[model samples]
Target: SEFTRFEQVAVLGTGVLGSQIIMQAAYHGKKVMAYDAVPAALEGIERRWAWIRQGYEADLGEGYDPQRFDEAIARITPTSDLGEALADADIVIEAVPENLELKRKVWAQVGELAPATTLFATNTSSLLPSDFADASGHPERFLALHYANRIWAQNTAEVMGTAATSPEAVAGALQFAEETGMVPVHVRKEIPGYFLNSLLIPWLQAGSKLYMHGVGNPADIDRTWRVATGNERGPFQTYDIVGFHVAANVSRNTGVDWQLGFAELLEKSIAEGHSGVADGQGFYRYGPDGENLGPVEDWNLGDKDTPLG
Candidate 1:
């Protein structure tokens, strides 16, 4: 099958999701140019790669190959220069934080600097693509390719496009997703949260609401969900995977009463250096190998008297 796929991928931002996207593409034989706005932000990418390698080892187990992982690392070129990152790139995947203004600003810069042939995609979880697609000055090329937290295992890429998005862009995104070892899930409509989070955010909040009002601890809440539905993970565990920084950002953006409270809770934990799995702590603690070391008693919300209603 002669499918359209990008040879060179430019991944903007070196944060949690951004790093994973860069590694995923590079692992699947895409030459990746990774960028971060701050020069110092690019420096810590090695740590992120180490963390990602651990994830690959944990997830792939016996199938884990150090040489392939190292080769994937070799394929990446980390740059602080926006123009350098976008130059000769076939696809630009923006995995910046969940901020509309930040996205618009970066997209405008990319639109000005990137070649016209480059396909644009955002890894936004909460915001809609249409909200900032016009800022890129190439709405036809702009779309959303939302990826899950654990890109290696939970590899679902939700491809979504706005009314202005051309069919070519959508098709290209699907091919890109597949080439990066992700199962492409096409979202037919332009909706906030896309497909995954449309169901996820509400369920996350429901579990959060219980925690907010001192109903149940994070572990018990997660256990109840897992035991009852036979699901592998619950909200807090999911939050750990998503990272507290992202969870806090999405929760704050929602502006729901309990969500805001949950955001605050995550922020406090983040301040304490517990920004989820990356930090080896968030809703729960984790071992050095990314193994869940059970729920942390510190996360129990029972002491708080303020209700989230």
Candidate 2:
């Protein structure tokens, strides 16, 4: 079929990204299943989905259509059952914590349960698809499908097909991304960090350095980006939205030393329970009424043209 109807799609990790993928797929009429080792992770997925549905209604001019939400939610069955999750899946996506060993373990388990023809894709930001395939038994069907945070709304995505990846597998993923309302870009090379993060990490590092140098606070740093580039949110706010821990993981895995002083500061903040938006506090305090705290002028580290020298 030109349109690949994923009869049974299984997402191994129900973290921030995986949850969105499952929600998007289910909304498009695919039967989806999610598995996570942590019960809290699964609960977070449910809560986040509800939050997104509410946001769609209030912000996107879409009414809270119970029928649509129910249909989407009905197609998804979240569980801790690994065997049942992979047993009948036509495609399996792994979004576990960004640890190589953990991924290999999960991939091995899924490989045992899924059909040989089942396609495997990793939702890894920087990891090479070739190395990921080595962990799985079915290397031929393995590839990487990267999604930006605002999965449903933005639909910006990339698919990495390794040398061993079959043409049929690549086509299936491309069709699937298009069906789910995504712009899919094919990655030709097996670079360490892939395309998106190769460009994003350095920018984040620069922002961190500015903060570390006592130039500004988190809110100020974010405001500069917003005003200068017309971005809705600043870098710090984006980090909070993306999850502080996930950001840390990305930093650790990519092996790119964020030569910025804020690295240590952030590490301390994370340790002290200043996680992010989820914790209701990080760079700035989120109000119960969801109001912006205030302007953060003190964090202004000068214009972009300001040179360190």
Candidate 3:
């Protein structure tokens, strides 16, 4: 078992979360291969680095070191080749979109390419580890290492395993999480959404319901949550951080009327390329430093009828 001894990491996908995972590993001194099949996705690696660096500076402030961050950027090798990325990897974490078939396809490909010693993990938000674990052809080596958005600040990595997962695989994932500047929480059983999203999805759903029912817009709803709970961000703000593409992906087929409606709204925004804070716009507008300037008033659902079932 290749547990607790990772020197090189291979991260699948170069979306918002995937990019953050790469930075998290690379910034902590792991040589990282950032893999994406899409050539255009790989092209955005520098932009992702710039965003993550801003996040670190904003979060760490006085402790932030630009040279260290640049060195981390230097440690990353962005590639469109799966074989090249996984060739020397001790661990390969999948952070692709939340599509079941796509995940299975990617893991099956990983099964073919990644070394036998390479540990397998997925950062899936809405799906279960067991669902695609066997696609890797090594269920014993597969597990979930879920990371939150804003990996520099909201850095909790939930290490979860399916029934077939070996103890060594689970231990390795927890070790990997801790090594990448994350607080690792070991989930005892397989469950969709794990800990963070178990607590998160319902709250986000409630906020979405309110908007779909025309109770309040994103700004006011976010303000209410922040003012009342003393929390820094609200559901819409979080949706912005997580990216609308992911939001739409997770929201589909939820069986809840409002969630599906929320999904529709997110898809519309995503079509306009306003994906999230990563793209400098979503429900909110952001500056170059990734600071939120304000909500996009036109995106507010106040005047629209719910697409709810």
Candidate 4:
């Protein structure tokens, strides 16, 4: 009685998360259609697609298969015509700009154009699904499906729904997540940042707060956390994975020095060739040969080691 199997999907917006999700869905064997408002955006899907392929090949290590990657990319279709792209879509994963008004407007179109049977999900990290549920025309079928920037290797997906979303839609979302080789985290209620971002946003914010006040260096802060907690990647390291481009866009300017400071950090990274792990250059440098070169020693913590209990 419910829409259980999804054969083809339409991914709206071709940003970092957008391209990664489209690649993952297609890599997992679902036909993928990439949709964008502007025709020019559609033309650049391949450029974004290239980075995803490189990341997978780099992170997957010995498990990477060239043939599988090649075949997976072939399944993705890019287009500017919304109606033509979504006409046969069983699911639509919307990852447009993170503005409520813009998203609501897009939902209105999805409601009017896409088939009624299509399930709708948003890749929103800072917004609530409830806000766009009514605008979707199919309140029972709308929900939020959020993923991290390195979704393929990270493999964790957040599946959350508004109060009005049906049981079937949630189940379908779970099935889709598992089918796409992701670990699905169920967010029981409507929240602004969902589950993962709820934890991540605060963590990064605290780090930035510390850095802004001249209390610590970004690399030292990351190293301290890593060594103290015994975790391999620190908050700053994770930020590098997400890239400064997206990180800068997600942050806000509160008319404070720190706000502009954060933007400047990202801009500087972009100004250089350091665009994060994709280029083997970010907060720290990664070798193309996949060797761990340790921190750049630029954090300037001091000559002496701090006391660790």
Candidate 5:
């Protein structure tokens, strides 16, 4: 017997997470179309895809193939043309800005273009799925398909269903995740932070507070976590890699007050051309090639103890 393949998918938001999803789907032989509201964001996705291809070739001992990358990219039509992308989509995964109003608007638009059977999934990190589904015409088919960064390498993703979401939709999302080589976990309840952010916010907040109080600089703070938890990178350094704007956005949505100071500081940095590793400065300074020189050594401790009494 022959196996049947599903219709192509549309990833509606080619941001950090969306781009990875597109790449992983292409790698798993799925036809994917990456879409974004902003052309610059789409360009960033293409650039990141190139970086991923380079890393893959370097690590896998295979030469990078521009043709293969182009083919994978060809599968993705990054466009502002919503109807063109969603007309035949079996699934439309939204990774848009983390704003409820914005998502609601997109949901309404997607409903008009996509087939009624098309499963709608949000890549929301902290927002409630129920609220998102309420905005869509087909709430039963609306779900949350969350992917962590570096999807191709991490293989960890989530499929969260709301109370109104159908069992078939949940199962389909899980199968889709698996088909893309992701380790899919279903979130039973629609909570504010779901699983990852609920756990991460508290920990990250405490770390930020420690840094603010001169418990240590970002380096010492991250070093403690790295040594204690055996993580490759500390939270502060990870924050830089994740981008200050993104960190600020996550902090804002999580409703966790623990990191407001850090968020404010990050926003200021972004305003001052210190976006992140890409801009050669964030919580730390970087070389022209985006290599970290080190953390900003001269943090204003303001009469605090050396090791944070």
Candidate 6:
């Protein structure tokens, strides 16, 4: 109920997903503030706005109104001063690089700078809130609000708090997620990858296993799953959107065949500068318009005629 009354949101990072969260909050008519220590980081607000509008157009489509986009973009205020950004900020969402030290460092900075009543939330995918909660200025105010890659369609928010987290903070977080148009998935205790990643990794691992074990190419494997499950995208296809750098890092230490194979493919793609669909290349090639040039083809196993997309 309290966090629900938040009037301003400060997005700590402007990287890929961070940008999405910023626009989403702003689109919902909240005063969104994006801050970066680097001056150059804050300089791309206009370009970021362009991309944000495109995303809204995609999700809202015929229902999308340009005036709403303009209004949303108008509300996103960028700040160069860290102190200024933290001032009067109701919620500060940290989405910096994924590392314990980096996160702790940011929390320490935000801890000193942000107001005591302000809620501190992280957008980490793999790390636990408990790991960095103590380092945050106020552990009671600290929590993790992890969201799916596409914040619009998948709109699932994982709200996890540390052992030191208060009921008020958790309740506020849930209210905040609902206010932002997200379905909040409440996490009772600390766990790696939250609820989404705990289940997602296994599904992706099986998808990679099929390709590495001479089962089929990436597209066919992806297509078969897409057709069978009635989902818009499959594992490999989703990988292109998730980025190879992430795949490589997550899979390299598994020591399992699937992880090793996943790492190998990512390395090759990154070296070739085909990191993911963000650059129009990954497990598949995409166009500049972000259209799937040939995202994935249907599989040809067991002599079945599968339709290709």
Name the best candidate (by lDDT): 1
- Ten consecutive residues with minimal summed lDDT in candidate 5? 55-64
TM-score of 1: 0.85
- Steric clash pairs (candidate 1): none
Tens digits of per-residue lDDT, candidate 6, 136-157, equal 8688878889888767666898
**Residues 1-309 of candidate 5: C-alpha lDDT, one tens digit per residue:** 111235588988876677777777776667887877777776667687876675445333343356666777677667778888887887888988889899899998998778877888888875787876877888888988876554555467778888998888888888888787789898887776767767766777777778766676888888788899988677777677667887887677656554565677788888888877656677788775445678876454657663233
Backbone clash pairs for candidate 4 read none
Candidate 2 lDDT trough over 10 residues, lowest sum = 300-309
lDDT of 4 at 57: 78
Poorest lDDT segment (10 consecutive residues) of candidate 1 = 300-309
Model 4: lDDT equals 0.81
Q: Find the 10 residues in a row with the least total lDDT in model 4.
A: 300-309
TM-score between model 2 and native: 0.76
Q: Model 4 segments beyond 4 Å from truth?
A: 289-291, 299-309
TM-score of each: 0.85, 0.76, 0.80, 0.90, 0.78, 0.84
Task: Enumerate residue pairs that collide in model 6.
Answer: none
lDDT of 1 by residue, 192-254 (tens): 888888888888878888888778788999999899999989998998987888778878887
Model 4 error, position 69 (Å): 1.5
Model 5, global lDDT: 0.74
Candidate 3: pairs in clash:
none
Q: Can you rank all candidates by lDDT, best first?
A: 1, 3, 4, 6, 5, 2
**Local distance difference test scores for all models:** 0.87, 0.72, 0.86, 0.81, 0.74, 0.79
Instruction: Give candidate 3 misplaced runs (Cα > 4 Å).
Output: 38-40, 99-102, 217-220, 248-309
